[PDB]
């Protein structure tokens, strides 16, 4: 007796697993009780893609926005004037919000948690090696340049 699983169940729980357990344990508990359903075509040849309906599809077709990294590149010198002062420095603090919000130009709006700051950004003025890494997958390379007034 195989039947597909539907929950925890001690030595077998995959919310969709196929384990050969005694027909007694079934039709007595795993089944009639709400915990598993027999492996009968319909329960597979009609419910087998529901499983592969992600890892295979909703994983490589999901272009909802995962293409962000690719979409962000055509820029016109991404720079933020943190304002200079006292022999040349920064009046502001170019950390994260600024780097991610550096897209509020054409009203556009990108993510933010896609920061690439191995450490607490320092104060200078030159370009920032900030690689706005959107999804935990694709990376990126955005620039930041502190200035003044």
């Amino acid at each position: 007796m195989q039947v597909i699983l539907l929950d925890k169940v001690a030595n077998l729980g995959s919310l969709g697993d196929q384990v050969n357990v005694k027909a007694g344990y079934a039709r007595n508990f795993l089944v009639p009780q709400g915990k598993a359903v027999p492996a009968t075509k319909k329960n597979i040849e009609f419910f087998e893609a529901r499983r592969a309906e992600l890892e295979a599809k909703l994983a490589e077709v999901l272009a909802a926005a995962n293409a962000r990294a690719e979409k962000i590149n055509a820029l016109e010198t991404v720079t933020i004037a943190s304002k200079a002062g006292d022999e040349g420095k920064l009046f502001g603090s170019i950390g994260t919000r600024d780097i991610a919000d550096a897209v509020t130009a054409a009203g556009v709006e990108v993510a933010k948690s896609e920061v690439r700051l191995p450490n607490g950004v320092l104060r200078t003025t030159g370009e920032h090696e900030v690689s706005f890494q959107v999804h935990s997958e694709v990376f990126a390379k955005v620039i930041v340049n502190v200035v003044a007034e």
């Binding site: 007796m1 027909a23 039709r27 089944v31 009639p32 027999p38």
Partner: protein, 77 residues
């Protein structure tokens, strides 16, 4: 009346045939135990006077595919 109910298995009659080939009517009878099956779809507990193997059927076909018939031939349950 000692019937599988699902496969119609009834008590057949045979011979004991002891050593020396001695004939003596014995008759064999099904297993039966009457189970507490859960139709689930029909949301009810239908107890049927099934029987070993005849139960394996309920599994192979379906507690509904079985009841599909039965009631088909107009039976209890």
């Amino acid at each position: 009346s000692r019937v599988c109910q699902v496969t119609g298995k009834r008590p057949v009659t045979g011979n004991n045939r002891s050593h020396a080939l001695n004939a003596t009517k014995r008759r064999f009878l099904p297993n039966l135990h009457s189970h507490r099956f859960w139709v689930e779809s029909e949301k009810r507990f239908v107890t049927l006077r099934v029987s070993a193997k005849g139960m394996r059927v309920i599994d192979k076909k379906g507690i509904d595919t079985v009841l599909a018939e039965l009631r088909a031939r107009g039976e209890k349950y």
